[PDB]
Amino acid sequence: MALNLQDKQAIVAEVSEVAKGALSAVVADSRGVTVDKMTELRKAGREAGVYMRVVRNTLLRRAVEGTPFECLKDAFVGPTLIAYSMEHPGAAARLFKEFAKANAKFEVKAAAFEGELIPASQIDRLATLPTYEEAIARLMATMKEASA
């Protein structure tokens, strides 16, 4: 490994994603294959490319060293194996969705999805999301309200 001069970058970089981010998910990759990463990188791909991460770090000692910053709801995620996912642009989006759909294709556990932060809380798969731009679901709420 590297000394501190390197354990600091994995911090100053990874914590300015939290400081400058959008949504957060969860997942434990016990059996995390590489067809695994391959896929989810195309997903990050659709979800821009390299706007996304997953930098395995669940050393509390790392991606909690980014938490007493923001998201101190994660002192509780960080135990055991974890795969932290941050969003920069994009809706508070679909990121959420396929992690459940992925891991529900066996694709290993999902930490039961211990969940995360947009609010400041816990678990439950939501597509309360990428409807986003479904302001059309407030366009159809126009003419249909005007007519009916």
């Binding site: 302001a135 407030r138 126009t142 005007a146």
Partner: peptide
């Protein structure tokens, strides 16, 4: 209110205008 006076603007408008707007149209009614 005037329905045409709220269609001419309600088909043509910006973006982030809406993004910090229709996370809340859901609130007054629904």
């Amino acid at each position: 209110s005037i329905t045409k006076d709220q269609i001419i603007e309600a088909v043509a408008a910006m973006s982030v205008m809406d993004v910090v707007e229709l996370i809340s149209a859901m609130e007054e009614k629904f």
